[PDB]
C-alpha cells in the first residue's frame, strides 16, 4: 500500500533524477489528482521527518483573494520553498494550498515545469477529463 508508492517515488526522484509534478504522478500510477497531491505530501513529510537534510526541494501553490486598489482580484501563484509565508501574509483570504512539485537539484526558473506537463500530455491525448474532478455530460465525441 504505502510502500508501493513510497518506493515508486523514491526510484523516480532520487535514482532516475527526474522532475515529478502531480499530473505526471497521476498519469503514471493512474490516480485521482487530489489523491496524488496527498501522496506527494505524505512522501515529503516522511522523508523530511526522518532525516531533515535530504537533497529535496519543494514548490507549492497558493491561491486566494486580494485587494490592490479597492477592487477584489483573485491571485493564483506557484511559489518556491523560501517565500511561502510572506506571500501568505500579503493575501486577504486564503482558498487553496497544496503541493506542486519536488526536485533533486535546484532549477533557475519555471522553464521545465511546462515541458514535463506538455510531454506527458503529448502521448496521452484521448484522456484529460479521465481524472478530472468535474464530469460534464453533453461533451461526448459525436461529430
Amino acid at each position: 500500500a504505502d510502500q508501493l508508492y513510497l518506493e515508486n517515488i523514491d526510484e523516480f526522484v532520487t535514482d532516475q533524477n527526474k522532475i515529478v509534478t502531480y499530473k505526471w504522478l497521476s498519469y503514471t500510477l493512474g490516480v485521482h489528482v487530489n489523491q496524488a497531491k496527498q501522496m506527494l505530501y505524505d512522501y515529503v513529510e516522511r522523508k523530511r521527518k526522518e532525516n531533515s537534510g535530504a537533497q529535496l526541494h519543494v514548490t507549492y501553490l497558493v491561491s486566494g483573494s486580494l485587494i490592490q486598489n479597492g477592487h477584489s482580484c483573485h491571485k493564483v501563484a506557484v511559489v518556491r520553498e523560501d517565500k511561502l509565508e510572506a506571500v501568505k501574509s500579503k493575501l486577504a483570504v486564503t482558498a487553496s494550498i497544496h503541493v506542486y512539485s519536488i526536485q533533486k537539484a535546484m532549477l533557475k526558473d519555471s522553464g521545465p515545469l511546462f515541458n514535463t506537463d506538455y510531454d506527458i500530455l503529448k502521448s496521452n491525448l484521448q484522456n484529460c477529463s479521465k481524472f478530472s474532478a468535474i464530469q460534464c455530460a453533453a461533451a461526448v465525441p459525436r461529430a
Binding site: 496527498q38 477592487h71 482580484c73 483573485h74 518556491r80 506537463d117 481524472f131 468535474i134 464530469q135 461533451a139
Partner: protein, 431 residues
C-alpha cells in the same frame, strides 16, 4: 462573488491519502440562442460602390435625431434642409460629419493635427462649421443634429448639438443560483514568452478542474461558458502560421472536453479583412471537431446567454476611433460608441467593411445588457445609466500575453472580477 465562496469549506489537501476524494458536475446551459444572423454573409457579391451605405445610414438615423431635438430644444421646431436656409435665422440641421484632416495617408501613434476642419454634409451639398464645437473629439461618420444660423461668409455658427443616444431595453429575468462566465482575449500563440505558456496552462488547469482544493473545484464547476475573443495567434511578421494551428487545436481539444467554448476571429486570424468577419473553416482543427461543445462564431457576436444578452467585438472599432481622435481611455471610447448609436461609425472611411446596400447593420436596434470590447491594454469595468430605465455594464477585456488576466462576469449580481495568473520566475531574493 467567486473567491468569497471558494473559502466556504474545509481544507483537505495537506494530509496523507484518503479513501475517497470528491467529484462534481458541470452546471447545465439550459438556454442559449445565437442572434448574430445579420453578420453571417451567405451570398457575398462585391462590385458595388460605397455610396449605398451612407444614404441608408442617414435615412434610418434621421427620425431619432428629429425626435430628440424636439424634446431637447423645445417643440417650437425649426428643423430645415440644408438648401432652404436663409441668412441669419435660427434653425436645426440633421446631417453627417466629415473631418477634413491632413496627415491621413492616401494611396500615392495618433494622426490628429492642430488644424483640421469639420464639414456637415447632406445628400445634396456641404457646409463648413465653426463656433462652440470640439474639433478633435469627433470623427468622420457620426450623424447628429445641430443648432444655429448661416452667416455671411457661407459658414455656419453652432451653438449646441445633440447625438442619437441609447435604444430601448427590455428587462431580464432574475436568476436563482449564480452562474459565471469567463472572458479571455489574445493568447498570442506563436510568440510572446514562456511565462505566457505557464499562465495559459494554469488557466486551463483551473477551469477544467485539475487544480486547487474542493473550494476551487466547487467554484470552477459553476462557470457555465467560455468566450475567447480574437487575436488567438499573434504574428511577428507575415512576409510560423502552420505550426500554431496545431497547438491551438490541442488547446481547444483540452477545453472542449469539459466546457462549452465560443471562438472568434481577430486582427490576425485566417479569415477575411472586412468587418463582418465570417467563422473559421473547420478543416484546420482535426482533433477538436470531435465534440459538439466547440463553436466557431462571427467576429461581431451577439448572444442570449441565460436571459442576459451579450454583444461584443475583438477590439477593432475602438482602436480605430483611438487612431483618429483625442480620447485615450478605452472604456470612455466604448461608452461614446454606445452614445452615438453605432458600433463603428468610422466605416467605411478608415476601417474597411463590406459594401452593403439594403440596410446598415451597425446601428443598434436594441440595447444590450452587457457590452464588451476586445484586446485592450488594461482591465476596466463600469456601469452606466440611460435616460429611461436602461442600465449597461461595460467591460474591457485585457490582453493575456502581457498582463495574464481574464474576467469573470456574474450573471445574477452582474459584476465583473479580474483573475490573474503568475508563476514564479527567475527570482532570487539574496542578490
Amino acid at each position: 462573488m467567486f473567491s468569497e465562496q471558494a473559502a466556504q469549506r474545509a481544507h483537505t489537501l495537506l494530509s496523507p491519502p484518503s479513501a475517497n476524494n470528491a467529484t462534481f458536475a458541470r452546471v447545465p446551459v439550459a438556454t442559449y440562442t445565437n442572434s448574430s444572423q445579420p453578420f453571417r454573409l451567405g451570398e457575398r457579391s462585391f462590385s458595388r460602390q460605397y455610396a449605398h451605405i451612407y444614404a441608408t445610414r442617414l435615412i434610418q438615423m434621421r427620425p431619432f435625431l428629429e425626435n430628440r431635438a424636439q424634446q431637447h430644444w423645445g417643440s417650437g421646431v425649426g428643423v430645415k434642409k440644408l438648401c432652404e436656409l436663409q441668412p441669419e435665422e435660427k434653425c436645426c440641421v440633421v446631417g453627417t460629419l466629415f473631418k477634413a484632416m491632413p496627415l491621413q495617408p492616401s494611396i500615392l501613434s495618433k494622426y490628429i493635427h492642430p488644424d483640421d476642419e469639420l464639414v456637415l454634409e447632406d445628400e445634396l451639398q456641404r457646409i463648413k462649421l465653426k463656433g462652440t464645437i470640439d474639433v478633435s473629439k469627433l470623427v468622420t461618420g457620426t450623424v447628429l443634429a445641430v443648432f444655429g444660423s448661416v452667416r455671411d461668409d457661407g459658414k455656419f455658427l453652432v451653438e449646441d448639438y445633440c447625438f442619437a443616444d441609447l435604444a430601448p431595453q427590455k428587462p431580464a429575468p432574475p436568476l436563482d443560483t449564480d452562474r459565471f462566465v469567463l472572458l479571455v482575449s489574445g493568447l498570442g500563440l506563436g510568440g510572446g514568452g514562456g511565462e505566457s505558456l505557464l499562465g495559459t496552462q494554469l488557466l486551463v488547469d483551473v477551469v477544467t478542474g485539475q487544480l486547487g482544493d474542493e473550494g476551487e473545484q466547487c467554484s470552477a464547476a459553476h462557470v457555465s461558458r467560455v468566450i475567447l475573443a480574437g487575436n488567438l495567434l499573434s504574428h511577428s511578421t507575415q512576409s510560423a502560421s502552420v505550426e500554431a494551428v496545431k497547438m491551438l487545436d490541442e488547446i481547444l481539444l483540452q477545453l472542449s472536453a469539459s466546457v462549452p467554448v465560443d471562438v472568434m476571429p481577430g486582427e490576425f486570424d485566417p479569415t477575411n479583412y472586412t468587418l463582418p468577419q465570417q467563422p473559421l473553416h473547420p478543416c484546420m482543427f482535426p482533433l477538436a471537431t470531435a465534440y459538439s461543445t466547440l463553436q466557431l462564431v462571427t467576429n461581431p457576436y451577439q448572444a442570449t446567454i441565460d436571459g442576459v444578452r451579450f454583444l461584443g467585438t475583438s477590439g477593432q472599432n475602438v482602436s480605430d476611433i483611438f487612431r483618429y481622435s483625442s480620447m485615450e481611455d478605452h472604456l470612455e471610447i466604448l461608452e461614446w460608441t454606445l452614445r452615438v448609436r453605432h458600433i463603428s461609425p468610422t466605416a467605411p472611411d478608415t476601417l474597411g467593411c463590406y459594401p452593403f446596400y439594403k440596410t446598415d447593420p451597425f446601428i443598434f436596434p436594441e440595447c444590450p445588457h452587457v457590452y464588451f470590447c476586445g484586446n485592450t491594454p488594461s482591465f476596466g469595468s463600469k456601469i452606466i445609466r440611460g435616460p429611461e430605465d436602461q442600465t449597461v455594464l461595460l467591460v474591457t477585456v485585457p490582453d493575456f500575453s502581457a498582463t495574464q488576466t481574464a474576467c469573470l462576469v456574474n450573471l445574477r449580481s452582474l459584476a465583473c472580477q479580474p483573475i490573474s495568473f503568475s508563476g514564479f520566475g527567475a527570482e532570487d531574493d539574496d542578490l
